[PDB]
Amino acid sequence: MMYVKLISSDGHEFIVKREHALTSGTIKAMLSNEVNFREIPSHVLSKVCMYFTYKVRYTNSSTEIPEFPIAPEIALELLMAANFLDC
Amino acid sequence: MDVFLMIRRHKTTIFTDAKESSTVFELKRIVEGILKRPPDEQRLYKDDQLLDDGKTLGECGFTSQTARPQAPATVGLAFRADDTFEALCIEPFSSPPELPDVMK
Amino acid sequence: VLRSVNSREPSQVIFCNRSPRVVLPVWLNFDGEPQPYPTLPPGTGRRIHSYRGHLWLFRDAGTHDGLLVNQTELFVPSLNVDGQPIFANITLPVYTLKERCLQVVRSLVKPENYRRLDIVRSLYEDLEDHPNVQKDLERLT
Ligand SMILES: CC(=O)NC1(C(=O)N[C@H](C(=O)N2C[C@H](O)C[C@H]2C(=O)NCc2ccc(-c3scnc3C)cc2)C(C)(C)C)CC1
């Protein structure tokens, strides 16, 4: 299986499936196997990775869909990341 | 049934899934393909508890309704350098700032 | 363009709310005006009387966020076979991460304060441009 490494501004290294990371057109362009994000800290990028897993699992599925949870304290930063990543 | 995991050591975090019926040892083979260290140089943990190779992830408390895609369960990881194993160390994620006033 | 047909052929329907939101059903009348109907609490169901060729869509009653019905945007009652009703299963879509972040930020900040947020102008416009049925009717056309 092909994995890629996404690195947060504080040096946390997140290893995810390549297919999952291609959810983002921005990440695809940065690849085309490691990407550094200078403006995205780990408490945000970890959530981004969890969104990829959630999306791939529940897209085109029958089983009832649960809400994607976002704590108030990270919502503003997560919004800015999602805008940059187009996801 | 699929379980969704974060496998964590120091500042490394791997997102992956596995079967509830799969074994601890089989999860080490997954880590081996990604980080290039064999099973005999790996220890896996749930919180502070060392996991035995022969046990299933289900037996050890990773079940499909607690290890969810949007909220995966954590498995700790320690490597052996030379003769002995390092202690389990997982660096915490960064802290969010204060909520702005207009969000209170 | 998008409007119910006046067929007068009865059709019984179960509205089943399999979402965690409060649900607003909306009937598109014979001139295409949206007409709101009583809400459904999370997890609950109602047996209602509608007609063949009538158009319905479903929204979050508090925010107007978009919801799906049998995996799509619009629901049209069909012919009942053997007296059994048609099921309208109402669910959350998989929202984009951006739209979900906008939902959460909208639920915490009063509209007058969107401009005090420290973000690019385009995201302030994205917040202000909140979900709305008329907007989506124009899109669907
Ligand atoms: C008299 C007449 O015009 N009959 C016809 C018709 O189309 N009637 C419409 C009608 O009865 N409709 C339109 C929609 O198909 C639904 C249906 C109606 O109003 N059914 C009653 C009803 C009441 C409550 C609810 C709901 S929705 C959530 N909770 C409830 C209880 C659903 C349906 C209406 C023009 C009177 C609004 C021509 C066949």
UniProtKB/Swiss-Prot annotation, chain A:
Keywords: Host-virus interaction, Nucleus, Transcription, Transcription regulation, Ubl conjugation, Ubl conjugation pathway. This is Elongin-C. The keyword Ligase does not apply. It comes from Homo sapiens (Human). The keyword Translocase does not apply. Overexpressed in prostate cancer cell line PC-3 and breast cancer cell line SK-BR-3. InterPro entries: ELC1, SKP1-like, SKP1/BTB/POZ_sf, Skp1_comp_POZ. Its main location: nucleus.
UniProtKB/Swiss-Prot annotation, chain B:
PANTHER family: ELONGIN B, TRANSCRIPTION ELONGATION FACTOR B POLYPEPTIDE 2. It comes from the Eukaryota. This is Elongin-B. SIII, also known as elongin, is a general transcription elongation factor that increases the RNA polymerase II transcription elongation past template-encoded arresting sites. Subunit A is transcriptionally active and its transcription activity is strongly enhanced by binding to the dimeric complex of the SIII regulatory subunits B and C (elongin BC complex). GO terms for molecular function: transcription corepressor binding; ubiquitin protein ligase binding. Keywords: Acetylation, Host-virus interaction, Nucleus, Phosphoprotein, Transcription, Transcription regulation, Ubl conjugation pathway. Signal peptide: none annotated. It is found in: Nucleus. SUPFAM superfamilies: Ubiquitin-like (SSF54236). Heterotrimer of an A (ELOA, ELOA2 or ELOA3P), ELOB and ELOC subunit. The elongin BC complex interacts with EPOP; leading to recruit the elongin BC complex to Polycomb group (PcG) target genes, thereby restricting excessive activity of the PRC2/EED-EZH2 complex. (Microbial infection) Following infection by HIV-1 virus, component of a cullin-5-RING E3 ubiquitin-protein ligase complex (ECS complex) hijacked by the HIV-1 Vif protein. The modification N-acetylmethionine is found at residue 1. GO terms for cellular component: Cul2-RING ubiquitin ligase complex; Cul5-RING ubiquitin ligase complex; cytosol; elongin complex; nucleoplasm; VCB complex. The modification Phosphothreonine is found at residue 84. One of its GO terms (biological process) is protein ubiquitination. Residues 1-66 form the Ubiquitin-like domain. The keyword Phosphoprotein applies. The gene is ELOB. Belongs to the Elongin B family. PROSITE patterns: UBIQUITIN_2. It comes from Homo sapiens. The keyword Transcription applies. SMART domains: UBQ (SM00213). InterPro entries: ELOB, Ubiquitin-like_dom, Ubiquitin-like_domsf. Pathway: Protein modification; protein ubiquitination.
Swiss-Prot record, chain C:
Changing residue 43 to A: In cerebellar hemangioblastoma. Keywords: Cell membrane, Congenital erythrocytosis, Cytoplasm, Disease variant, Endoplasmic reticulum, Membrane, Nucleus, Repeat, Tumor suppressor, Ubl conjugation pathway. Changing residue 56 to C: In VHLD; type I. Changing residue 37 to N: No interaction with HIF1A. No HIF1A degradation. Changing residue 106 to G: In VHLD; type I-II. Changing residue 95 to C: In PCC and VHLD; type I. The keyword Cytoplasm applies. Changing residue 17 to T: In VHLD; type I. Changing residue 105 to D: In VHLD; with RCC. Changing residue 106 to Q: In PCC and VHLD; type II; common mutation. GO terms for biological process: amyloid fibril formation; cell morphogenesis; cellular response to hypoxia; negative regulation of apoptotic process; negative regulation of autophagy; negative regulation of cell population proliferation; negative regulation of gene expression; negative regulation of receptor signaling pathway via JAK-STAT. The Elongin BC complex binding domain is also known as BC-box with the consensus [APST]-L-x(3)-C-x(3)-[AILV]. This is von Hippel-Lindau disease tumor suppressor. The chain holds residues 62 to 202 of 213 of the full protein.
